[PDB]
């Protein structure tokens, strides 16, 4: 079984750091913000062997037909914000609308991810994030790519959302 996961969110939120923690169990201080790529990882989730194909989105904000085509192949999306960046939380609505646009569905597996949970400099309340995820009908997972808190949970939870969708 294979799962096409897409990691979206504003520059600097930790998309690349989360991806490399999942794949390689290492925290990257610097990952070129211009590198958009997909990584495959074989994992066992609830006793099911699966291949996770994880697209780490990057580069420039642009909307070619081709870009839509890449993004539309995603079966589930991590909507990543950073808890120290109010703007990245405000941008979650944009990512949610672009997913709704390219998938032509209100029923798309997503997980809201609050990254950089290790930082003291919080500007986005857990309450707000939980309220937003409740309004969207999706899980919320707090993560730190730095300490690896919540990383397996964020990705495995998205897989479980895809399975629940495939049952419908
Ligand atoms: C700092 C560099 C970086 O990580 N990025 C992330 C992606 N960027 C971005 N900013 C705003 N909106 C979008 C993007 C990436 C492309 N996005 C996009 C385009 C077409 C279709 C879809 C579908 C679902 C989600 C996103 C989509 C919009 C800035 C650079
Ligand atoms: N403290 C802390 N720093 C992080 C975390 N995740 C990413 N970073 C750092 O934040 C910066 C941006 O991370 P990156 O993964 O490139 O974000 P992207 O632009 O969304 O791919 C990098 O210097 C990372 O090391 C985190 O959970 N905690
Ligand atoms: Mg990146």
From Swiss-Prot:
Q: How is it modified after translation?
A: Acetylation at Lys-103 prevents interaction with guanine nucleotide exchange factors (GEFs). Lysine-depalmitoylation by SIRT2 promotes its localization to endomembranes in endocytic pathways.
- List the GO molecular function terms: G protein activity; GDP binding; GMP binding; GTP binding; GTPase activity; identical protein binding; LRR domain binding; protein-containing complex binding
Q: Which SMART domains match?
A: RAB, RAN, RAS, RHO
- Residues that bind GTP: 9-17, 28-34, 58-59, 115-118
What positions carry the motif Effector region? 31-39
Family (UniProt): Belongs to the small GTPase superfamily. Ras family.
Indicate whether Cell membrane appears among the record's keywords: yes
Give the domain of life. Answer: Eukaryota
Outcome recorded upon mutating residue 39 to A: Decreased interaction with MAPKAP1/SIN1
What happens on changing residue 13 to I?
In NS3; affects activity and impairs responsiveness to GTPase activating proteins; characterized by a strong increase of both intrinsic and guanine nucleotide exchanged factor-catalyzed nucleotide exchange leading to an increased level of the activated state
Question: Known EC number(s)?
Answer: 3.6.5.2
What is this protein identified as?
GTPase KRas
Q: How is its activity regulated?
A: Alternates between an inactive form bound to GDP and an active form bound to GTP. Activated by a guanine nucleotide-exchange factor (GEF) and inactivated by a GTPase-activating protein (GAP). Interaction with SOS1 promotes exchange of bound GDP to GTP.
Known outcome of mutating residue 33 to L? In NS3; characterized by a defective GTPase-activating protein sensitivity and a strongly reduced interaction with effectors
Sorted alphabetically, which Gene3D superfamilies does this protein's record hold?
P-loop containing nucleotide triphosphate hydrolases (3.40.50.300)
Q: Which disease is it linked to?
A: Leukemia, acute myelogenous: A subtype of acute leukemia, a cancer of the white blood cells. AML is a malignant disease of bone marrow characterized by maturational arrest of hematopoietic precursors at an early stage of development. Clonal expansion of myeloid blasts occurs in bone marrow, blood, and other tissue. Myelogenous leukemias develop from changes in cells that normally produce neutrophils, basophils, eosinophils and monocytes.
Q: Which residues are glycosylated?
A: 34
User: Where does this polypeptide localize?
Assistant: Cell membrane; Endomembrane system; Cytoplasm, Cytosol
Name positions with the PTM N6-acetyllysine. 103
Subunit and interaction comment: Interacts with PHLPP. Interacts (active GTP-bound form preferentially) with RGS14. Interacts (when farnesylated) with PDE6D; this promotes dissociation from the cell membrane. Interacts with SOS1. Interacts (when farnesylated) with GPR31. Interacts with RAP1GDS1. Interacts (active GTP-bound form) with both SHOC2 and PP1c (all isoforms) to form a tertiary complex; SHOC2 and PP1c preferably bind M-Ras/MRAS, but they also bind K-Ras/KRAS, N-Ras/NRAS and H-Ras/HRAS. Interacts (GTP-bound form) with MAPKAP1/SIN1; inhibiting K-Ras/KRAS activity.
Q: What is the effect of changing residue 33 to R?
A: In CFC2; characterized by a defective GTPase-activating protein sensitivity and a strongly reduced interaction with effectors
Which Gene Ontology cellular component annotation is one that this UniProt entry carries? endoplasmic reticulum membrane
Reaction(s) catalysed by this chain, per the record, are:
GTP + H2O = GDP + phosphate + H(+)
Q: What does this protein do?
A: Ras proteins bind GDP/GTP and possess intrinsic GTPase activity. Plays an important role in the regulation of cell proliferation. Plays a role in promoting oncogenic events by inducing transcriptional silencing of tumor suppressor genes (TSGs) in colorectal cancer (CRC) cells in a ZNF304-dependent manner.
Q: Which species expresses this protein natively?
A: Homo sapiens (Human)
Q: How would you describe this protein's topology in the membrane?
A: Lipid-anchor
- UniProt entry keywords in alphabetical sequence: Acetylation, Cardiomyopathy, Cell membrane, Cytoplasm, Deafness, Disease variant, Ectodermal dysplasia, Glycoprotein, GTP-binding, Hydrolase, Intellectual disability, Isopeptide bond, Lipoprotein, Membrane, Methylation, Nucleotide-binding, Palmitate, Prenylation, Proto-oncogene, Ubl conjugation
């Amino acid at each position: 079984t294979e799962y096409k996961l897409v990691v979206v969110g504003a520059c600097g939120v930790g998309k690349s750091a989360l991806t490399i923690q999942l794949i390689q169990n290492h925290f990257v201080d610097e990952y070129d913000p211009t590198i958009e790529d997909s990584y495959r990882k074989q994992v066992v989730i609830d006793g099911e062997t699966s291949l996770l194909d994880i697209l780490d989105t990057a580069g420039q904000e642009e909307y070619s037909a081709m870009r839509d085509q890449y993004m539309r192949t995603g079966e589930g999306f991590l909507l990543v914000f950073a808890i120290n960046n109010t703007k990245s939380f405000e941008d979650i609505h944009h990512y949610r609308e672009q997913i709704k646009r390219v998938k032509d569905s209100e029923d798309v597996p997503m997980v809201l991810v609050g990254n950089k949970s290790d930082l003291p400099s919080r500007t986005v309340d857990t309450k707000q994030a939980q309220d937003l995820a409740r309004s969207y009908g999706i899980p919320f997972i707090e993560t730190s790519a730095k300490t690896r808190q919540g990383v397996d949970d964020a990705f495995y939870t998205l897989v479980r959302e895809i399975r629940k969708h495939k049952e419908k």
